[PDB]
């Protein structure tokens, strides 16, 4: 379920609209994403985050 | 210039004695001039 | 065949002690607060942070 | 309860700690806090909504909600819309003092 960010979107805001809660849902997104943490926290205009299923 | 803009021109007098501060403020007489006489001593980040 | 795991430890990042990390943060803090630093600003709750 | 002041870092407990928490809540939006998307208020989303009698039922709710959630040491008295000047809506918020 890969989604594309915008240039000011942030990680905990995005996966709260997708999942509905943030307990164990942000660091699992950083886990199943290669090089996402290396990228700066204010995301670039066209990075791809693949949100995993069953948080 | 303060009448052309309807502004309040905030002046500052010299850092000399109060005899020189009153004798400088006796030249102006206009309602759009605000004079703050003693100079502020402020900490600098360049000269430390 | 010589074991390399019996040597002194290599440091990939430098390992500074607690005091020179603290004053390195304070210097950056003063630059950020330049023009706004006061003796009252360096209060006890702020320092313990 | 003893907290620190927002500016100047001073430890104040009763008067300004109750004020720096309420006056922050009315202008902090939802999702601005990190890992806390439910802190804040919908008052930043009430901008440019039409000023109706159902709109005041929402603002008097969202004042009672967003302060009722995260500020239990404040008893809200009245949120009365007292003036509509130039689109600006004057809402009077008189709060009680505790502690």
């Amino acid at each position: 379920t890969t989604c594309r960010t915008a240039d000011g979107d942030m990680l905990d805001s995005l996966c709260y609209h997708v999942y509905g809660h943030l307990l164990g849902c942000v660091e699992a997104t950083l886990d199943a994403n290669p090089g996402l943490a290396d990228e700066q926290q204010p995301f670039r205009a066209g990075l791809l985050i693949s949100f995993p299923d069953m948080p | 210039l303060a009448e052309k803009l309807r502004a309040i021109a905030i002046l500052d007098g010299p850092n000399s004695t109060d005899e020189a501060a009153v004798a400088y403020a006796k030249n102006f007489g206009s309602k759009r001039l605000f004079m703050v006489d003693p100079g502020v001593q402020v900490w600098d980040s360049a000269t430390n | 065949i010589i074991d390399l795991s019996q040597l002194p430890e290599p440091e990939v990042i430098e390992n500074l002690d607690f005091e020179t990390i603290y004053q390195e943060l304070l210097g950056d803090f003063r630059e950020a607060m330049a023009g706004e630093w006061t003796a009252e600003v360096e209060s006890d709750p702020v320092l313990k942070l | 309860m003893i907290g620190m002041d927002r500016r100047s870092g001073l430890p104040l407990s009763g008067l300004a700690h109750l004020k720096q928490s309420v006056e922050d809540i009315l202008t902090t939006p939802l999702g601005s806090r990190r890992m806390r998307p439910e802190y804040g208020s919908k008052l930043r989303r009430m901008v440019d909504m039409p000023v109706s009698e159902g709109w005041k039922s929402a603002v008097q709710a969202e004042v009672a909600r967003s302060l009722g959630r995260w500020e239990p040491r404040i008893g809200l008295s009245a949120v009365r819309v007292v003036a509509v000047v130039d689109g600006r809506v004057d809402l009077l918020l008189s709060g009680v003092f505790e502690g």
Side-chain angles (χ1 to χ4, degrees):
Chain A
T1 63
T2 304
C3 291
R4 181 183 296 115
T5 60
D7 206 2
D9 289 333
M10 285 193 59
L11 182 61
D12 55 346
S13 67
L14 285 173
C15 63
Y16 180 71
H17 299 305
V18 175
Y19 293 153
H21 68 283
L22 293 179
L23 290 174
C25 300
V26 181
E27 62 268 12
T29 302
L30 288 172
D31 196 3
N33 278 315
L36 183 62
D38 187 2
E39 299 170 344
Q40 274 200 310
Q41 181 46 238
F43 294 135
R44 61 181 200 94
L47 62 80
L48 277 72
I49 291 182
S50 66
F51 296 100
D53 291 329
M54 192 59 70
Chain B
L1 189 68
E3 302 179 334
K4 295 295 189 57
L5 298 155
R6 284 204 183 104
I8 300 177
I10 298 176
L11 312 175
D12 46 323
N15 293 343
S16 174
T17 167
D18 295 320
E19 187 180 2
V22 177
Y24 172 69
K26 218 206 159 187
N27 314 319
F28 293 137
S30 90
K31 66 163 180 172
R32 295 190 165 96
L33 289 177
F34 192 85
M35 176 161 152
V36 190
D37 170 59
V40 145
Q41 164 191 335
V42 64
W43 188 267
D44 192 16
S45 177
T47 66
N48 310 323
Chain C
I1 306 167
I2 291 170
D3 194 4
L4 199 66
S5 66
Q6 297 297 320
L7 298 183
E9 298 292 333
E11 292 184 355
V12 183
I13 193 169
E14 61 185 2
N15 198 359
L16 300 174
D17 53 353
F18 179 74
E19 183 66 27
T20 193
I21 294 171
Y22 182 76
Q23 294 294 320
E24 189 178 2
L25 293 175
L26 262 58
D28 192 5
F29 181 75
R30 294 300 160 64
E31 293 293 349
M33 301 269 301
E36 294 186 358
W37 182 81
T38 327
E40 300 303 319
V41 158
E42 59 179 359
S43 204
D44 302 358
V46 160
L47 286 188
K48 298 292 188 294
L49 287 173
Chain D
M1 288 183 282
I2 307 171
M4 62 172 282
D5 197 1
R6 293 180 65 189
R7 64 180 63 86
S8 70
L10 294 174
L12 40 82
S13 71
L15 198 60
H17 163 59
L18 266 54
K19 293 177 59 55
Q20 77 186 5
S21 303
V22 173
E23 299 179 25
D24 160 61
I25 263 292
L26 310 177
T27 176
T28 294
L30 296 170
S32 66
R33 289 287 295 270
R34 296 292 161 263
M35 299 297 294
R36 296 290 183 269
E38 49 187 4
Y39 183 83
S41 307
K42 284 185 179 180
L43 303 181
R44 210 193 191 103
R45 293 294 140 262
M46 296 304 178
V47 190
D48 298 309
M49 287 193 56
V51 194
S52 51
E53 70 275 352
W55 186 74
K56 312 186 184 314
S57 176
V59 182
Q60 293 173 7
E62 289 293 326
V63 164
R65 181 198 65 87
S66 62
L67 284 168
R69 296 292 182 186
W70 302 108
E71 194 69 26
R73 294 296 177 170
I74 287 298
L76 303 173
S77 179
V79 193
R80 290 184 176 183
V81 173
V82 298
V84 177
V85 172
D86 198 0
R88 155 197 169 184
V89 179
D90 279 315
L91 300 102
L92 184 67
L93 183 53
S94 56
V96 303
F97 176 70
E98 244 90 357

